[PDB]
Amino acid sequence: VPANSTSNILNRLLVSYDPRIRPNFKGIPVDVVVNIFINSFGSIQETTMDYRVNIFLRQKWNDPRLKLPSDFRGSDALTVDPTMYKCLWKPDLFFANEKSANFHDVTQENILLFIFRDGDVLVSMRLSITLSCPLDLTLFPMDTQRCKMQLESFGYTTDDLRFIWQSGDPVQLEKIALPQFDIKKEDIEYGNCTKYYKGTGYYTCVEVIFTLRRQVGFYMMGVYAPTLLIVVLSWLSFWINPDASAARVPLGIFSVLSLASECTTLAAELPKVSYVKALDVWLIACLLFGFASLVEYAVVQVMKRIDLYARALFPFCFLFFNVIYWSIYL
Amino acid sequence: LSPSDFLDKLMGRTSGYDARIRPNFKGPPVNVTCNIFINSFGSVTETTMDYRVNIFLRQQWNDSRLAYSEYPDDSLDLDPSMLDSIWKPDLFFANEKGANFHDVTTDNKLLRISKNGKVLYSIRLTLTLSCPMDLKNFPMDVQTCTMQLESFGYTMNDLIFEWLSDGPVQVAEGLTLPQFILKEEKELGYCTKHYNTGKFTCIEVKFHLERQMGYYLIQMYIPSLLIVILSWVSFWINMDAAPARVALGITTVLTMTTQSSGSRASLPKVSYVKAIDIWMAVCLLFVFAALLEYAAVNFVSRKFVDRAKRIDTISRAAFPLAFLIFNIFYWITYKIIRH
Amino acid sequence: LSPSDFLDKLMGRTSGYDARIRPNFKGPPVNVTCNIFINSFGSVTETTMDYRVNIFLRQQWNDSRLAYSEYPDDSLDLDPSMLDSIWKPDLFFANEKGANFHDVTTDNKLLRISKNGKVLYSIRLTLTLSCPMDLKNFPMDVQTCTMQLESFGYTMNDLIFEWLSDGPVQVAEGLTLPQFILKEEKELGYCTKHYNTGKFTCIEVKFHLERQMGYYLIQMYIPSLLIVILSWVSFWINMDAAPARVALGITTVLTMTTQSSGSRASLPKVSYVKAIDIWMAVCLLFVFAALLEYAAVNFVSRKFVDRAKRIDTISRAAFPLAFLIFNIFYWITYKIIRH
Amino acid sequence: LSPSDFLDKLMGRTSGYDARIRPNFKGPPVNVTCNIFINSFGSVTETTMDYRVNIFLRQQWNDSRLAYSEYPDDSLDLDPSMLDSIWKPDLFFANEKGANFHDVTTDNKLLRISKNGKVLYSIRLTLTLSCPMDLKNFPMDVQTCTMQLESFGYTMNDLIFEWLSDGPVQVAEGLTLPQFILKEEKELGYCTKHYNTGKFTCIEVKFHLERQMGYYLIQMYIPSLLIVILSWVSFWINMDAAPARVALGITTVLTMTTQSSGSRASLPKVSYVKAIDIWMAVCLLFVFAALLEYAAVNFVSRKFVDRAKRIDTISRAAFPLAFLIFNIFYWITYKIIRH
Amino acid sequence: LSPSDFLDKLMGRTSGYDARIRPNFKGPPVNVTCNIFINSFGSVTETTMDYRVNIFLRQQWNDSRLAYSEYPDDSLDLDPSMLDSIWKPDLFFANEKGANFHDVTTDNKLLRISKNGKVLYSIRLTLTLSCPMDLKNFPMDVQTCTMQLESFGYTMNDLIFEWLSDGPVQVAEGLTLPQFILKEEKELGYCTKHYNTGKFTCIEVKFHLERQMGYYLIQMYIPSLLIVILSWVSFWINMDAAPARVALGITTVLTMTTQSSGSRASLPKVSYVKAIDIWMAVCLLFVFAALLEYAAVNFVSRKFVDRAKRIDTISRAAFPLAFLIFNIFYWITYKIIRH
């Protein structure tokens, strides 16, 4: 008559209940219905390709060997302690792109299982996983990161187990704030991707694909508008009189030295990634244009009327570089 | 007789005490009076959006199946080893990221059963809580770090959390955060999560972190303003020595941009406009505009000299008023309004 | 008979001994005398306000229940598996953040029973204790780093800690620290915590970590002082050579700004104003004052050449007095008054 | 009937199955057919010389002591709860620095017994394998970070590891590293330990991590090369004064030094000479040689000016030729010869 | 009969054996011989003074109670889960900071019992030992990083450690630390600690780690020496002529200062003066002295040019000698007398 007496006369002491024989044995595949509930979403490292995320992963399936009889009518949801949580069957999922998952054990175990009157079983657990989504930052200050998280069965083919989403809001998240990125709950489009392995079986899988988008404002008021100002200053270097140039030399060389210092200093705050990004293309094209202004002044000195072509040709190429650059990277 | 044999007679495999059902079952909800007492408050970062607290947590409730009068002991102590044979509320923190107890010499838990059924449970936790902090106005920001205790399985028909009467959150006397100040107005209130399966009890306490502006104001703001003053006194001097004036002037721009580039890698690494990057952009804009107006004066000098003198005087009279209007529209905007 | 069998006869199922009660139950508080032995003292870091130690902890006490007078060997012992079967004093470190035992090749715990009942308990712990460091005078500071042992659930009338007679705290012979050095003047004492229930016993030892300043005095103080001296001799001698004056002064202020800026990744990143930040700000201010006085000379220039030389000699006499009184008022403040 | 009953009939206390005795005892050695499947590959650091891998690990052997023909389930999926009742090969990774299992929602092991005893065992591990990385030529190199699976306590007369024939080491698609790119030729191999006790089987795989150098070619090479070209543009003029000469020498030396400083901040912290420090020191030496050519000009400038122009023509012929000789020697040494 | 049931009669419950009474009880001590095979090495950190090392620790001894005569084969081994049934030598490392076993596929432990009683015990540990590193002469030094085993509770009349006779400690073949290089001549001896209770056995290894100097020579010494030569060039050209010498002087100042600033983020952060710090401060001081003794010439120039020529020639003949005497002092102090 207490809450554990019905469990002890329902399984493991009563008529046989094998906790490793799945429900509907030698029959239809079990349909597990999962829906995660994200708490925190942080530490998206560009040098380890991980991102930590805490989920309230709950999964709800059908167990016909656990139909509650008419011994009590007030309790529709007969609970069970996490002590005997190993005593009844549960689907064996695992995250195929994780690194080190762990449960939470504050003030209690954070697992909770319900058994319903009509045979349904529900499991909620609080996981803190650290997944692995590859960050291909080739468009770094204006890039997107479409990267995902996939739950798969382990040892059960698709004719034994099958994961489906809840189909009404099956993935949620709080009002959170990433340091750099901006998690778009607009595009949260999930989906199945079953893993046909090489001959050995056909294992189920479901996944959620987040679409992170980095915000550009710090880089624009960082190493974009100061660099563009330095390049426009290097253009204004020519406007001093070319006869006996005492100001064209400093107005070129200190702009070039300032841009070289800006590049070699703000190579630090960027993610240490050894392939060519977008910001490096921009900074090196701007440094090359400063050096081209120095070259044009030098061929004016060693040979005049070439500055009249320079002031109308080289910014006319700076605008072409700018439109092709901010048209390919936007 | 011993208190261990008495507790085995009162609850266990002899009496009728069940460790799975809450007290006064099938009735009113039990009210768990909960308070904390923090010890450490550190590791509050801006790249992980978290902080770390190290609390004592004391929670009292009423267990009607522990009333006894056949023993002179008023407060029966209980060892933390055989502690899983008595009901305890399934409290958990709704925003943690990592939480652990301690076993320094013994277990760091304590249970005391009073005579009137009052149960007191004192544990010692270390938590890595999360808090979403924005850095729109970085060196003049305030943060509200929240701590939300709540139930897990029981709804508000079975478990209700309530703070203590006096001093629900106490702080260890003498804390010092690295780059912050922990204020003494901890707004504690209700949370009351409204999920689909009902409403779960949820209490919370909000701290107050006000970052003090000593090091930023003496290391970045005043040097950048000093380089701005050098930019003004560049073209304040007479325009005869044009290479020397343009030399100092340009060098001043190089000094300002080297100051900004060095001050980049000390700030927190977020990707939006902080209130110090607006400053490091506008001061660089002003030193560049000073250089460009001086270069326009030398482009004029090629109204032979009276125009040059009038341009220099108008620039030297218009830049101070413009910079001070920007200083007002910046400091009154960030310091006063978004306090 | 066997030592294990005799120990089972002493404190096993027979003789009626419950290890969940204190010795001298309902009587005087026990006499628990504990000392430590510190091997490592590392990672005193100012970003999370902690420091790590790796200690031996030896605590002895008395119990009249484990008094045996039959076995020949006076110093009995038991392996660290069955430590539950004997009452141990429940201490905990009142300000630690993470504490772990060592279990390499065997558990690193050792219990010993004497003939008089003098029980000796030796643990090897690794601790991350919390120390509230402040760096208001950074390169000349001293820190009082605490370590507090405290009972957990036993009041003053039940358990009392006290250090040993000779050498209660002692450190390994040839240890060292990267930044600080650990002075051999450790202040031991009692800081008894007073709560609402009882007066829980607590003992403490305070270390005086003193920071040495060789690297700072070599690479941040003397180069800045020499840059100020260079800006002094920029105007002490030269009178009217503007291309030998203004570029020199501007490159000097560039060198001082870069020197002050590149040394922010070599400091503990805090927000309140430190001593080294005050020195950097005042040195930058003085080089700016040299540039401003040169610009004032050039403004008053374009007779009054005697007045201009009077300004030059007035500045050349005022800069020594001002920089020397700043130097004195800085070192006397951060070397004598804050002793 | 049920598999939990039939496995207890097959390997339980009733049936004769000594769990810690290898199959075919006092006979031929067991052939363990082993293969891996790497999911992730990252954190290849040059500060601790180890990478972190996350593998599936399947090993499948045979034993006649588990042959059964009772009921037609041709694969007894044994649960990882009673996994300690079946002989499994004590494999260990001979170069790891710490490695763990995965236990999310269920233990991530699998042990399936086939009909003829062809038992299969699939685990999922996360390893931090050590790898001695050679950075003698930093931005243009290959790494041979390997991975060795070898036996513990079992000689080759007891247990023989051997790889799967049909492509054992597979890689998950879309596996990018922040620095390297994993080549598609993972060379298998037969390691073998020859100790003083016996021959211990050791299968191994050797990867290939070619670092890509796009970032270093764009930022650490081309700016400094353009700086050297600017320093050549300095002395390509025929000015026998120096208002441009000292300016461009100053600028080129300053840019070369600050680019070397940023490189020091960005390169890995390795205390022997690499193929980037050689190049930066040579470029700084070339800027030094150009400024000393200017010093020769200004010193020998008062026949005199004729010989000065002749040595200037000689240096203008020499410096591009010496730079081209160095460029050919360096790039052929570090791109084709050592490749 | 079987190797897993014969030990149930050799050391099990139906025989005379207890797992915590040592061999030869109340008599002569046991001579445990230890040897060590180091796989990995590195993470030598100068901020926490530790270094991680991944060893095979094999200790062997011989008792009498583990002897048999009726069994066929020579040496039988047992389950690493049943490792609590045998007395093992209570060993612990005297200066560890945390160590752990390994648990990949199977607990990496092994114990093998011979017929004559020669018990072998081979484990695999992952220690993080601590060695005090004194960076007094940073880029050229040796570090004597040690490793001390020790008994725990058994004095030197019960347990005696002694190293293996033939090759006690042997490091793996392909070992490459990031900074240091481990010398192939490893010292070894006995620590033999004396406490207030008795002699405790202790044996120690000392690895001599010699730091490599190629990176600091190529990137921190040679460019600053080049800057000193450019400082001499700044006043070897024709004196007092034009604003082309103060420019080179203050530019040598600025490049030497950004070198001495950027060369403090790649070094270990210790707060006592090191070798490269002295060598950078003296170079900055020589650059400042060159600029000051050119400012002296520029002052005394305004037959006044004959004195300027005299002091210029005296400085040009003195400053190379003044650098050579300091260079000889520095190198013979940090390379000959201190090894």
Ligand SMILES: O=C1C[C@@H]2OCC=C3CN4CC[C@]56c7ccccc7N1[C@H]5[C@H]2[C@H]3C[C@H]46
């Ligand atoms: O025999 C194997 C090895 C192989 O390893 C690559 C990873 C895989 C992931 N899922 C989970 C375990 C596995 C599996 C399930 C049931 C029996 C054998 C078995 N496996 C792994 C396998 C694939 C497919 C499947």
Ligand SMILES: O=C1C[C@@H]2OCC=C3CN4CC[C@]56c7ccccc7N1[C@H]5[C@H]2[C@H]3C[C@H]46
């Ligand atoms: O049905 C649900 C789904 C929902 O998942 C988001 C997480 C929540 C956290 N706590 C712990 C589990 C949960 C709960 C308790 C009892 C029955 C159902 C149930 N849940 C989750 C729920 C919320 C609220 C509650």
Ligand SMILES: O=C1C[C@@H]2OCC=C3CN4CC[C@]56c7ccccc7N1[C@H]5[C@H]2[C@H]3C[C@H]46
């Ligand atoms: O009632 C309380 C609450 C309070 O919590 C802050 C932490 C403290 C630490 N020790 C351990 C538990 C405690 C204690 C002992 C006995 C009865 C009540 C009780 N406590 C906590 C208390 C303090 C003091 C003491």
Ligand SMILES: O=C1C[C@@H]2OCC=C3CN4CC[C@]56c7ccccc7N1[C@H]5[C@H]2[C@H]3C[C@H]46
């Ligand atoms: O006698 C030895 C010493 C040697 O130690 C280096 C480590 C090794 C790893 N495996 C595990 C233990 C060992 C081994 C197995 C069985 C008998 C003796 C024995 N060992 C170590 C040995 C090697 C090889 C083997």
Ligand SMILES: O=C1C[C@@H]2OCC=C3CN4CC[C@]56c7ccccc7N1[C@H]5[C@H]2[C@H]3C[C@H]46
């Ligand atoms: O009583 C003590 C305290 C003292 O602590 C400093 C460290 C020491 C290291 N070994 C390990 C434990 C110890 C020891 C062994 C047996 C009885 C008492 C005892 N100890 C510590 C002791 C020393 C010596 C010894």
Ligand SMILES: *[C@@H]1O[C@H](CO)[C@@H](O)[C@H](O)[C@H]1NC(C)=O
């Ligand atoms: C995804 O594909 C599988 C493949 O059979 C299918 O069974 C399932 O219904 C699909 N939809 C989901 C999981 O929502």
Ligand SMILES: *[C@@H]1O[C@H](CO)[C@@H](O)[C@H](O)[C@H]1NC(C)=O
């Ligand atoms: C607990 O709170 C409820 C609120 O509904 C109140 O009615 C009740 O009196 C309180 N106390 C107990 C002992 O239930």
Ligand SMILES: *[C@@H]1O[C@H](CO)[C@@H](O)[C@H](O)[C@H]1NC(C)=O
């Ligand atoms: C608990 O019970 C006591 C006495 O029965 C009563 O005074 C008190 O209000 C109850 N509730 C709480 C929260 O203590």
Ligand SMILES: *[C@@H]1O[C@H](CO)[C@@H](O)[C@H](O)[C@H]1NC(C)=O
């Ligand atoms: C230990 O100290 C207490 C402190 O009052 C004292 O009363 C007692 O006699 C001491 N000795 C014991 C308990 O043996």
Ligand SMILES: *[C@@H]1O[C@H](CO)[C@@H](O)[C@H](O)[C@H]1NC(C)=O
């Ligand atoms: C324990 O009792 C003995 C017996 O007299 C006494 O000598 C010793 O000082 C006591 N120890 C303490 C800590 O009170």
Ligand SMILES: *[C@@H]1O[C@H](CO)[C@@H](O)[C@H](O)[C@H]1NC(C)=O
């Ligand atoms: C194992 O492999 C070896 C060599 O590949 C072979 O000689 C032997 O027959 C195989 N089988 C057994 C049972 O040893």
Ligand SMILES: *[C@@H]1O[C@H](CO)[C@@H](O)[C@H](O)[C@H]1NC(C)=O
């Ligand atoms: C194991 O033995 C069976 C015996 O028939 C054989 O068919 C199988 O190929 C063997 N497997 C391996 C890997 O040697």
Ligand SMILES: *[C@@H]1O[C@H](CO)[C@@H](O)[C@H](O)[C@H]1NC(C)=O
């Ligand atoms: C250990 O060595 C000592 C040497 O003095 C010897 O007397 C003793 O018998 C040895 N013990 C064993 C068990 O070999």
Ligand SMILES: *[C@@H]1O[C@H](CO)[C@@H](O)[C@H](O)[C@H]1NC(C)=O
């Ligand atoms: C085994 O004991 C004998 C005793 O004479 C001796 O060879 C030695 O002490 C032991 N051998 C070892 C420890 O290898």
